[PDB]
Amino acid sequence: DDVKKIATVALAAAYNNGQEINGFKAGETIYDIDEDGTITKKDATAADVEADDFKGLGLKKVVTNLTKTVNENKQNVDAKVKAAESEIEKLTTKLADTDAALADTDAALDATTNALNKLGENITTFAEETKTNIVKIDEKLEAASKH
Amino acid sequence: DDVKKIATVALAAAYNNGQEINGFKAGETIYDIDEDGTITKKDATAADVEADDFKGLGLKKVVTNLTKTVNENKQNVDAKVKAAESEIEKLTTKLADTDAALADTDAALDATTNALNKLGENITTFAEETKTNIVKIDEKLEAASKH
Amino acid sequence: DDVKKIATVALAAAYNNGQEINGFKAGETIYDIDEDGTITKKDATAADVEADDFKGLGLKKVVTNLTKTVNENKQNVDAKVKAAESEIEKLTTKLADTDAALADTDAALDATTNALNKLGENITTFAEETKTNIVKIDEKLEAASKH
Ligand SMILES: [Cl-]
């Protein structure tokens, strides 16, 4: 009957859809429905298994695994980014400590420069006063000589 | 008939596959096809729902949600990495500003050191010439005493 | 017969499930099973295709593509994080080089300051001994005048 054929094709089609959802292994029964509604009972080979989009795992297993991958890949990258930010936080503190130390060096350099200028000025006055005193003495001697 | 059985199994198999694709809820009709081709009409419990890979959501819903997760997880991490790179860019500018300021401190220190050394050489000369003059005066006095 | 109906619904149901797994295009035969078990043979429009969860791609194609997306998104972010860490490593070395240079500036400044201080103490001794010698000469002259 025609109803025998429709029922046979439907069962084999339902079977094959089930294997796409729940997977298949090497040796497991697989049906090939020919364009003329012909059912061919075949036992899947290592070829059919290895050369399948999901390699006989089925949509459920693949989606369960992909969900695991997505979740692990987020945990993995979040830890890497938290590690990078930790490194950035330490560099920031060390750069602020360097700038604070540089500001103090600059303060100490200004004090040494000003003490230098003040010393230079004080030596000049003493040199001028000393010159004036030695010149005066020389004059008192040059005058006391000629008599 | 045997065709009655094949058609019944095919419908129930097609039905279940549909529920794996489109999902099921607590109370919704579920068929269990026994290894002897026996169909058992039941009503999915809260147990069947809670203890299912996708918890009665179906492959379509789960894949639509997983696509949302993948896309949001990329937007979330791209913003975190753009934030980290923004910090790195600010640290680079500040570190280049510190190095430029350190180079100027070094230049300022060199000039203070040169000014100090020049002053040191100038005072030594002055000190020497002063010693010479005072020594000469003392001699003119030590000689003028001897009479 | 009732078995004719069950077989025709099963085939159409198995057919649609297959299209949900393997996809459908505009023009491709689609069956709509009415709640009264009525099969309606139609042709999928551009509307049915554009307004479908996966736009007629099917669960297999969508899951294969999503797997590609997940994998590329990890390669893309791992390279961005390796790039950020590369910058962090170069900032660390440059900050350690700045701190080493700042420590040497401090050492050089400490030495200029101590040389300034020693010089300052040496001129004070010289100035004091010079004042004394001049005061003595002035006394020998102030006394030798009084006769
Ligand atoms: Cl099916």
Numbering used by the authors:
A (entry chain B), B (entry chain C), C (entry chain A): 28 to 174
Paper text:
Neisserial adhesin A (NadA) is one of the main vaccine antigens, acts in host cell adhesion, and may influence colonization and invasion. NadA belongs to the OCA (oligomeric coiled-coil adhesin) family, a subgroup of the trimeric autotransporter adhesins (TAA), which generally mediate adhesion of Gram-negative bacteria to target cells or to the extracellular matrix and invasion. It was recently demonstrated that the NadA3 N-terminal region binds specifically to the endothelial cell receptor LOX-1 (low-density oxidized lipoprotein lectin-like receptor 1). The structure of NadA3 24–170 presents a small globular head region (residues 24 to 85) and a long trimeric coiled-coil motif made of canonical heptad repeats, plus the two novel undecad repeats.
Through a cavity-filling mutagenesis approach on NadA3, we identified the mutations A33I, I38L, and A39V, all of which increased thermostability, with the A33I I38L double mutation conferring a remarkable 17°C Tm increase. Next, we performed structural studies to verify the organization of the most highly stabilized mutant; we crystallized and determined the structure of the NadA3 24–170 A33I I38L double mutant. Upon superposition, the mutant structure was confirmed to be essentially identical to that of the native protein, even in the relatively flexible wings, exhibiting a root mean square deviation (RMSD) of 0.23 Å for the pairwise superposition of 144 Cα atoms. Moreover, the residues mutated to I33 and L38 present unchanged backbone positions and more-extensive van der Waals’ interactions mediated by their side chains than the original Ala and Ile residues in the native structure.
